Amino acid sequence: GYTVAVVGATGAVGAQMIKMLEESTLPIDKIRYLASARSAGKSLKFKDQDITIEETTETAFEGVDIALFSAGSSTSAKYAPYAVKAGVVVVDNTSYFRQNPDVPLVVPEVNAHALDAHNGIIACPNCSTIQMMVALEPVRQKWGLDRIIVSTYQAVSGAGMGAILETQRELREVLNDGVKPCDLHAEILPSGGDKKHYPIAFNALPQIDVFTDNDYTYEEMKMTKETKKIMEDDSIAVSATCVRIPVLSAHSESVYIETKEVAPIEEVKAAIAAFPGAVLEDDVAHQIYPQAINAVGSRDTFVGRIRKDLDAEKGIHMWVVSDNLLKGAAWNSVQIAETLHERGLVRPTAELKFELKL
Amino acid sequence: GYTVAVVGATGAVGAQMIKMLEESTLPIDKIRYLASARSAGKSLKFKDQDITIEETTETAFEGVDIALFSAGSSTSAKYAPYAVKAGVVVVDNTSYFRQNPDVPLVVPEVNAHALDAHNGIIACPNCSTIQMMVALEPVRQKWGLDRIIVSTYQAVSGAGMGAILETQRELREVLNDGVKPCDLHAEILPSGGDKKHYPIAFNALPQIDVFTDNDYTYEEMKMTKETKKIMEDDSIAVSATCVRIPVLSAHSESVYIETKEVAPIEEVKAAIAAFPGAVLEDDVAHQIYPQAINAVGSRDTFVGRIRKDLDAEKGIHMWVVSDNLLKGAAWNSVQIAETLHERGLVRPTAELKFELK
Ligand SMILES: NC(=O)c1ccc[n+]([C@@H]2O[C@H](COP(=O)([O-])OP(=O)(O)OC[C@H]3O[C@@H](n4cnc5c(N)ncnc54)[C@H](OP(=O)(O)O)[C@@H]3O)[C@@H](O)[C@H]2O)c1
Numbered sequence: 001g002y003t004v005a006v007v008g009a010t011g012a013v014g015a016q017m018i019k020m021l022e023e024s025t026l027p028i029d030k031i032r033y034l035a036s037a038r039s040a041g042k043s044l045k046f047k048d049q050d051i052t053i054e055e056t057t058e059t060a061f062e063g064v065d066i067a068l069f070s071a072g073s074s075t076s077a078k079y080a081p082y083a084v085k086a087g088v089v090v091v092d093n094t095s096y097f098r099q100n101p102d103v104p105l106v107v108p109e110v111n112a113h114a115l116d117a118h119n120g121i122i123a124c125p126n127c128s129t130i131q132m133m134v135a136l137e138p139v140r141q142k143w144g145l146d147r148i149i150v151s152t153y154q155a156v157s158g159a160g161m162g163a164i165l166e167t168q169r170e171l172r173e174v175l176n177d178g179v180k181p182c183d184l185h186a187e188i189l190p191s192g193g194d195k196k197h198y199p200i201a202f203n204a205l206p207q208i209d210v211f212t213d214n215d216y217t218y219e220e221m222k223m224t225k226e227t228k229k230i231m232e233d234d235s236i237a238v239s240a241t242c243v244r245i246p247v248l249s250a251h252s253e254s255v256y257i258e259t260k261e262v263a264p265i266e267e268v269k270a271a272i273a274a275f276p277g278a279v280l281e282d283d284v285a286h287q288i289y290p291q292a293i294n295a296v297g298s299r300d301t302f303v304g305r306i307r308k309d310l311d312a313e314k315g316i317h318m319w320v321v322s323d324n325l326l327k328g329a330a331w332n333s334v335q336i337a338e339t340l341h342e343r344g345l346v347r348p349t350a351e352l353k354f355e356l357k358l
Numbered sequence: 359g360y361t362v363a364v365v366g367a368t369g370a371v372g373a374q375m376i377k378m379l380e381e382s383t384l385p386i387d388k389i390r391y392l393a394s395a396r397s398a399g400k401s402l403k404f405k406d407q408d409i410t411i412e413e414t415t416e417t418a419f420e421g422v423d424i425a426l427f428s429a430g431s432s433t434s435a436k437y438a439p440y441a442v443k444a445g446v447v448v449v450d451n452t453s454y455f456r457q458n459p460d461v462p463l464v465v466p467e468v469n470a471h472a473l474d475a476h477n478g479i480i481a482c483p484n485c486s487t488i489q490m491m492v493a494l495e496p497v498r499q500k501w502g503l504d505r506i507i508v509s510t511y512q513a514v515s516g517a518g519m520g521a522i523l524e525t526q527r528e529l530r531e532v533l534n535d536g537v538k539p540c541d542l543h544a545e546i547l548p549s550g551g552d553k554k555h556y557p558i559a560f561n562a563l564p565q566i567d568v569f570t571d572n573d574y575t576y577e578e579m580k581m582t583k584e585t586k587k588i589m590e591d592d593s594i595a596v597s598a599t600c601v602r603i604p605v606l607s608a609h610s611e612s613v614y615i616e617t618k619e620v621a622p623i624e625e626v627k628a629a630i631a632a633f634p635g636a637v638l639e640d641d642v643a644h645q646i647y648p649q650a651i652n653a654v655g656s657r658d659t660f661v662g663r664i665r666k667d668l669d670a671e672k673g674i675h676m677w678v679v680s681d682n683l684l685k686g687a688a689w690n691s692v693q694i695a696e697t698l699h700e701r702g703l704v705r706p707t708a709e710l711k712f713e714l715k
Pocket residue numbers: 007008009010011012013014034035036037038039040056070071072075159160161162163
């Protein structure tokens with residue numbers, strides 16, 4: 001069996017990585033929980049076992065077969081290359097390595113083939129991108145994809161445990177203490193590292209991550225760039241608006257596409273229904289559509305409100321929902337590791353292709 | 359001055375209509391509040407004065423100059439034609455008369471001209487449509503509009519006072535009682551008149567109003583058909599997705615447009631800033647963009663996140679936010695009434711064109 005390390009075991013994704021590992025088929029002989037100096041020394045469960053949390057260091061990866069990283073881009077940049085050098089296969093939840101040509105960017109239902117040529121690091125894509133890829137890939141396979149316009153409705157757990165706690169505090173202050181939403185104090189949202197912070201309670205913040213040079217945010221551009229890499233087609237036009245709403249878990253997305261060929265809606269429905277990891281929830285006669293609260297806890301991606309555009313021949317609208325901590329993060333990572341095992345790809349990489357930052 | 363009646367004075371919109379009238383320049387000699395039998399007798403304030411709520415009947419409109427309706431489509435269906443008969447000018451905040459060719463469907467900043475030929479009824483458009491029209495008209499004036507794609511983030515107050523209280527209860531039960539959002543009991547949302555009801559707490563419900571036979575909701579279809587009427591151009595392609603989110607007040611909209619001619623972004627920002635009723639809130643270097651919680655209480659429509667599409671040369675994305683009970687309803691209605699007064703259009707209609715029921 002494998003020695004498996006979870007880096008960032010204490011965070012929101014880390015907690016779900018633990019759960020998905022507990023429920024995994026992976027033969028695990030030994031598990032290790034790694035975090036920062038803040039959590040080192042504390043204890044955390046794996047099933048019934050007590051696991052002591054260790055500080056993540058350059059030397060902490062000896063004897064490790066598989067390491068799942070979810071501790072921010074900084075941690076992966078510093079330590080993932082040292083893990084590869086130790087002989088680990090890293091599944092990385094951060095954006096740091098995603099656009100590196102030596103790094104597969106994988107949703108297993110879409111591009112498992114990319115895993116075969118890995119060089120020690122597999123990047124888990126952006127959470128909002130992942131669920132959109134599951135929904136759209138069965139459509140692309142049959143009718144092609146020319147463009148995507150997406151507006152997201154994103155849960156706060158994607159910004160981490162602190163953002164979850166901030167959201168609950170703000171809501172409790174409003175609903176129990178009578179504080180006005182605009183009088184709330186915020187410390188993290190919309191973006192922890194950015195200069196200014198705004199309340200999320202009873203609000204909708206059209207900012208996820210920091211702004212880039214082109215007035216789109218990094219989140220919006222990640223949706224653009226990662227889609228093109230995952231689907232291996234730079235010609236797919238993608239533009240996004242990414243918005244944080246008062247939901248703790250599960251991202252929802254209003255997705256518009258134009259296919260290359262006319263895609264009859266009933267066949268699109270059937271195509272999505274038949275695609276692994278995708279579930280059709282589309283019965284408007286009984287008000288059946290994907291809902292964030294129903295998707296929580298499920299590894300599946302739910303698709304409904306499917307209908308053609310009122311004017312554009314090749315245009316289709318839909319509503320896509322998935323648990324952002326599961327398919328958006330921890331489940332996608334564990335599924336990658338299971339696929340690596342299936343394909344006999346869990347082994348050291350001889351040639352190091354990644355800078356050691358010390 | 360005028361005698362002004364508010365029909366549906368006790369509701370969420372009714373309360374804001376009172377507030378907008380209290381803050382209005384309209385010369386009001388006498389104020390009347392109308393509602394159902396359940397409210398008849400009770401008292402509501404107009405500034406410092408005590409006004410007794412009257413039951414709305416087909417004969418209760420004698421002497422009235424202006425009637426603002428926001429009491430449901432069936433209430434306007436039954437009573438507005440009798441108000442017109444009595445010589446009233448009706449400003450209707452329901453969807454009922456909106457597609458009638460004899461009825462102007464008005465956003466004052468956009469199509470005030472349409473008021474001149476009114477036949478006693480002027481329809482206030484759908485809330486989510488209004489703020490989109492305020493944002494987009496200044497762009498259409500200069501570079502035209504080929505298509506609109508819009509995804510909404512709608513506040514629960516649009517569904518009425520009960521939807522607010524249902525949302526608050528649900529959130530309290532999750533946060534205070536540890537009830538999973540899954541297990542919440544709902545009675546109103548997504549749509550009061552529909553068969554099944556779902557929790558909104560920590561959720562996003564892709565249903566507003568009921569479904570039509572083309573799989574779009576009436577809300578999505580209203581944004582389509584009302585846009586075409588307001589902008590007087592049936593050639594504008596409009597497709598919408600309308601979503602309820604856990605916000606009490608103010609609608610947000612992710613709006614994609616394609617113009618007829620390429621519209622330079624700084625000029626688009628300048629045109630929106632210069633347009634009455636629209637405010638530019640767009641300074642990404644300082645994280646400035648419209649926000650629902652900031653828009654509550656204001657008559658203005660706030661526009662930001664303005665940027666060209668990454669690929670379509672004439673494509674532009676933006677973010678539009680307005681208080682759905684103000685510009686979305688009560689303020690648009692009162693502003694209509696003020697515009698009628700300015701244009702000398704508050705007078706009895708000679709020819710009745712609406713069937714008495
Ligand atoms: N409510 C509770 O009683 C409870 C439950 C769960 C989590 N928590 C705590 O709340 C914190 C919230 O985290 P967050 O909002 O900042 O984001 P987060 O995404 O939820 O977690 C970030 C993860 O990255 C790890 N990390 C950060 N810097 C690191 C470094 N230099 N080297 C190795 N790992 C590093 C963190 O470990 P560290 O934990 O050591 O910082 C954490 O596991 C967690 O870190 C956790 O300690 C509390």
